[PDB]
Design an enzyme around this catalytic site. Structure first.
Site, mmCIF file in Angstrom:
data_model
loop_
_atom_site.group_PDB
_atom_site.id
_atom_site.type_symbol
_atom_site.label_atom_id
_atom_site.label_comp_id
_atom_site.label_asym_id
_atom_site.label_seq_id
_atom_site.Cartn_x
_atom_site.Cartn_y
_atom_site.Cartn_z
ATOM 1 N N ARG A 44 0.826 -1.200 0.000
ATOM 2 C CA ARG A 44 0.000 0.000 0.000
ATOM 3 C C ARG A 44 0.864 1.256 0.000
ATOM 4 O O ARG A 44 1.776 1.393 0.824
ATOM 5 C CB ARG A 44 -0.952 -0.021 1.211
ATOM 6 C CG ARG A 44 -2.053 1.030 1.201
ATOM 7 C CD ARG A 44 -2.838 0.957 2.495
ATOM 8 N NE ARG A 44 -3.744 2.093 2.667
ATOM 9 C CZ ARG A 44 -4.338 2.410 3.815
ATOM 10 N NH1 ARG A 44 -4.122 1.685 4.907
ATOM 11 N NH2 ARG A 44 -5.151 3.456 3.883
ATOM 12 N N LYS A 46 0.761 5.797 -0.748
ATOM 13 C CA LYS A 46 0.109 6.990 -0.189
ATOM 14 C C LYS A 46 -1.357 7.064 -0.659
ATOM 15 O O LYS A 46 -2.268 7.152 0.174
ATOM 16 C CB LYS A 46 0.877 8.281 -0.557
ATOM 17 C CG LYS A 46 2.303 8.362 -0.014
ATOM 18 C CD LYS A 46 2.999 9.664 -0.442
ATOM 19 C CE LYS A 46 4.501 9.593 -0.316
ATOM 20 N NZ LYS A 46 5.166 10.760 -0.954
ATOM 21 N N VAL A 50 -1.650 -1.886 -4.208
ATOM 22 C CA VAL A 50 -1.103 -2.751 -5.244
ATOM 23 C C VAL A 50 -1.457 -4.206 -4.954
ATOM 24 O O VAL A 50 -1.320 -4.682 -3.823
ATOM 25 C CB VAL A 50 0.412 -2.504 -5.457
ATOM 26 C CG1 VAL A 50 1.051 -3.556 -6.356
ATOM 27 C CG2 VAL A 50 0.669 -1.105 -6.009
ATOM 28 N N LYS A 65 -2.563 -1.609 -9.749
ATOM 29 C CA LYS A 65 -2.381 -0.482 -8.839
ATOM 30 C C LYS A 65 -3.730 0.246 -8.800
ATOM 31 O O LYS A 65 -4.106 0.920 -9.763
ATOM 32 C CB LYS A 65 -1.259 0.444 -9.352
ATOM 33 C CG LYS A 65 -0.881 1.631 -8.461
ATOM 34 C CD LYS A 65 0.182 2.468 -9.236
ATOM 35 C CE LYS A 65 0.766 3.686 -8.578
ATOM 36 N NZ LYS A 65 1.638 4.465 -9.527
ATOM 37 N N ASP A 153 11.232 11.179 -9.299
ATOM 38 C CA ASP A 153 11.127 10.308 -8.110
ATOM 39 C C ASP A 153 12.059 9.083 -8.200
ATOM 40 O O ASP A 153 11.691 7.988 -7.786
ATOM 41 C CB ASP A 153 9.659 9.906 -7.790
ATOM 42 C CG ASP A 153 9.408 9.547 -6.328
ATOM 43 O OD1 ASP A 153 10.237 9.958 -5.448
ATOM 44 O OD2 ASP A 153 8.435 8.801 -6.062
#
Ligand SMILES: CC(=O)NCCCNCc1ccc(-c2ccccc2)c(Cl)c1
Length: 324
Positions: A44, A46, A50, A65, A153
């Site tokens: 899991r 934010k 998944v 997802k 990211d």
């Protein structure tokens, strides 16, 4: 602030129809989730859950997802980017886009990746293995930068490795954005430890070079066996951690070059720091992973000045990769 632009792939998006980069106007066609059977929860995030699943039409394992639709414009951005990058080297493959008939919650369906654990890899990884996988991430980054996209990211959690098959995948394009020269971006991107100095000093006109800083942070953690390499406790402290290694003189030269105004929160915490030599991070536990080429390469990624960092394509030509 003084304006800035990428040294590579500067106008790739400008020379493309609005269709390629205008995600807000993109038409998403949500298929029926009935073609997928959820097997087990994988984790899991934010604003996501998944699951491992089976596509019932061809008996293939997939990853689903399930997204908490907190921001629709952001979901469209992620879908547009995944669609543009689909099939690219070491890029996670978006297989489908579905909505459950009753919940109507958006879900992204990806190719299945059999991940090897961060700790399970960490102690047995060789100097060659680090070089091999670093080259694989650079193929993904040079490809997405050439496609006018910044990942924003890059971190170990967003890199999936199937060590048995020597397969690497760059995942989670939820923070990814289209690069437009002269555009001012939101600095609230990347995970704390991997945030480039440009984000920490609130310099908004950043580019693909942000991803090269993050990659630098990852390499430093692997060769020195120090995770994370720059261990900040908050966003202001994060810049202090960087300054403790890179030094405060080069930080002031960076803010002066771009006419950046430092936030007053940095006054009581920044202090004065000398520039450290990369060789001081070498110890008995990591010396088998370090070499002069690795140190020269790291030195060329971890630079305050985003313009002075190696591009993904220049990084691939570095002697550190002559053995791959
Ligand atoms: C969905 C899901 O399970 N995600 C979690 C993925 C966990 N990633 C593990 C990982 C990623 C990258 C590296 C790496 C490799 C070479 C150089 C630098 C870093 C390592 Cl050692 C481990």
């Amino acid at each position: 602030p003084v304006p800035s632009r990428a040294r590579v792939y500067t106008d790739v998006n400008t020379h493309r129809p609005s269709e390629y980069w205008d995600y807000e106007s993109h038409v998403v066609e949500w298929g029926n989730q009935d073609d997928y059977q959820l097997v087990r929860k994988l984790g899991r995030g934010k604003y996501s859950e998944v699951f491992e699943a089976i596509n019932i039409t061809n008996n293939e394992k997939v990853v689903v997802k399930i997204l908490k639709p907190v921001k629709k414009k952001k979901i469209k951005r992620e879908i547009k980017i995944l669609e543009n990058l689909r099939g690219g080297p070491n890029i996670i493959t978006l297989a489908d886009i579905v909505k459950d008939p009753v919940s109507r919650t958006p879900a992204l369906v990806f190719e299945h990746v059999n991940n090897t654990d961060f700790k399970q890899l960490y102690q047995t990884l060789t100097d060659y293995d680090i070089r091999f996988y670093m080259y694989e991430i650079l193929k993904a980054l040079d490809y997405c930068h050439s496609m006018g996209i910044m990942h924003r990211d890059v971190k170990p959690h967003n890199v999936m490795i199937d060590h048995e098959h020597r397969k690497l995948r760059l995942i989670d394009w939820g923070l990814a954005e289209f690069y437009h020269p002269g555009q001012e971006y939101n600095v609230r991107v990347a995970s704390r430890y991997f945030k480039g100095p440009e984000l920490l000093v609130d310099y908004q006109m950043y580019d693909y070079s942000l991803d090269m800083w993050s990659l630098g942070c990852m390499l430093a953690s692997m060769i020195f066996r120090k995770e994370p390499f720059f261990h900040g406790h908050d966003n202001y402290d994060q810049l202090v951690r960087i300054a403790k290694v890179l030094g405060t003189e080069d930080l002031y030269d960076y803010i002066d070059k771009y006419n950046i105004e430092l936030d007053p929160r940095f006054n009581d915490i920044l202090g004065r720091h000398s520039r450290k030599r990369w060789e001081r991070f070498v110890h008995s536990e990591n010396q088998h992973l370090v070499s002069p080429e690795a140190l020269d390469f790291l030195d060329k990624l971890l630079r305050y000045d985003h313009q002075s960092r190696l591009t993904a394509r220049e990084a691939m030509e570095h002697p550190y990769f002559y053995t791959v």
